[PDB]
Symmetry: C2
């Protein structure tokens, strides 16, 4: 767990498109908080809105940025190599290829972007056991997803 | 994780002393919430106060009840067989024999009896994956203990 938040601003610093066509060895959950995002894949084009958590399993093409009509795309991301049991709570409904999708119900959403947010901090924390809490919260989050669906 | 809360009331229903002189195969964290408790062991006698979380490792003699001058001793308890890594966050300062001891600082206490409480509910919940959240929260709790000391 190394996690963080990326503030894409139109015409700003990191306003480039991340483009990892052959993926990574680790899972990446992506949660839009501000602006719209545009996850692209083989000619297709989804479009995230805030409150959306997308799953990018090992090997998935990573290609997304700010959707051309959006003024930005702030989003927290968490990169991780999953715990043993975790595997089961990682079969998520795709949109195209095996890029997972979530989008809580009005009531569940705040706590999810809130529980997700808690992960980022933990993981980016100058602390002793803080790497584990991130892992632990990353755990709690997924569990939460189940009890939801 | 099977957990619960036990409301000892003077002269009431369960106002008897639990007496397992040869312990159990599982760990038991004990958190006083109301009244005073009296953990006894080989002629000795500690005395818990609310906010106290005590550890009872496998094999520990379990013998405690309502301290004779207290009107009750409400306390949540959580019985569990620890996860692999967990082992490390379970060396706790004793009082007598290897009965662990905690007692947060004013600020940490509420969230701990609050995070502990969350475990009880989860575990006693009529739910799908709720047994795991209890386990997950039991995890978070211990981690919390570390970042504290």
């Amino acid at each position: 767990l190394v996690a963080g938040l990326t503030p894409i601003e139109a015409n700003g610093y990191l306003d480039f498109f991340i483009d990892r066509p052959l993926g990574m060895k680790g899972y990446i959950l992506n949660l839009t908080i501000r602006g719209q995002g545009v996850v692209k894949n083989q000619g297709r084009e989804f479009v995230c809105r805030p409150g959306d958590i997308l799953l990018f399993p090992p090997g998935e093409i990573h290609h997304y940025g700010r959707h051309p009509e959006a003024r930005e795309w702030y989003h927290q991301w968490v990169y991780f190599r999953p715990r043993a049991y975790w595997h089961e709570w990682l079969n998520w409904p795709s949109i195209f290829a095996n890029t997972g999708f979530f989008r809580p119900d009005e009531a569940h959403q705040p706590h999810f972007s809130d529980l997700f947010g808690q992960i980022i901090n933990a993981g980016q924390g100058e602390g002793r056991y803080s790497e584990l809490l991130a892992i632990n919260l990353l755990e709690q989050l997924l569990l939460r997803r189940m009890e939801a669906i």
